[PDB]
């Protein structure tokens, strides 16, 4: 019989290699969502994010009006918020 010379490189450590490569790569990538998911749990389970939202909106608002020193002081406050999880429990505690 006649076959198109589309054989290329066949099985027998020729093409199984690419399939193993793709399955391993996709396995690692997909495990990306299931393996280190517990670590970033202090930054994604906040009860009430109203205060951080107001802080970010105030950074944007003060950057808008060409007023700049206040931007650095507000950015300092925001960075120290993400640099201290106990104050980000005090600061995103569900309002009474």
């Amino acid at each position: 019989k006649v076959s198109p010379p589309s054989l290329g490189f066949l099985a027998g450590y020729g093409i199984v290699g690419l399939y193993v490569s793709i399955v391993l790569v996709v396995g690692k990538f997909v495990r990306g969502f299931f393996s280190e998911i517990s670590h970033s749990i202090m930054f994604e389970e906040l009860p009430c994010v109203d205060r951080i939202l107001k802080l970010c909106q105030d950074i944007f608002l003060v950057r808008e009006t060409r007023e700049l020193e206040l931007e650095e002081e507000l950015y300092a406050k925001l960075i120290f918020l993400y640099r201290s999880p106990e104050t980000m429990i005090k600061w995103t505690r569900e309002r009474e």
Partner: protein, 96 residues
């Protein structure tokens, strides 16, 4: 993103502990498992479908026979292409 999730939750609550809806669990699990088995399998489907060169008849259309004594000259050359090239009948194959 967290703020929108909290707002949506507040608008449409869920009671003090209820079975997660069976329909949503089945749909979401089915979607995820279908994707995670598609990635596992469809590579195999493509890899074993491309290497499926189907039997196709390749009949020699021209046959040539020559008889050349030493290097002097073909005593007898002949080429028979359309009419003298005939395939077997099935019964002739059984005879063979």
């Amino acid at each position: 993103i967290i703020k929108c999730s909290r707002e949506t939750e507040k608008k449409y609550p869920q009671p003090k502990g209820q079975k997660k809806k069976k329909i949503v669990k089945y749909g979401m699990g089915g979607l995820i498992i279908l994707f995670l088995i598609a990635i596992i399998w469809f590579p195999l489907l493509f890899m074993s479908l491309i290497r499926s060169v189907v039997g196709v008849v390749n009949q020699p259309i021209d046959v040539t026979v020559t008889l050349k004594l030493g290097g002097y000259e073909p005593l007898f050359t002949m080429s028979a292409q359309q009419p003298s090239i005939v395939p077997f009948t099935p019964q002739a194959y059984e005879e063979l």
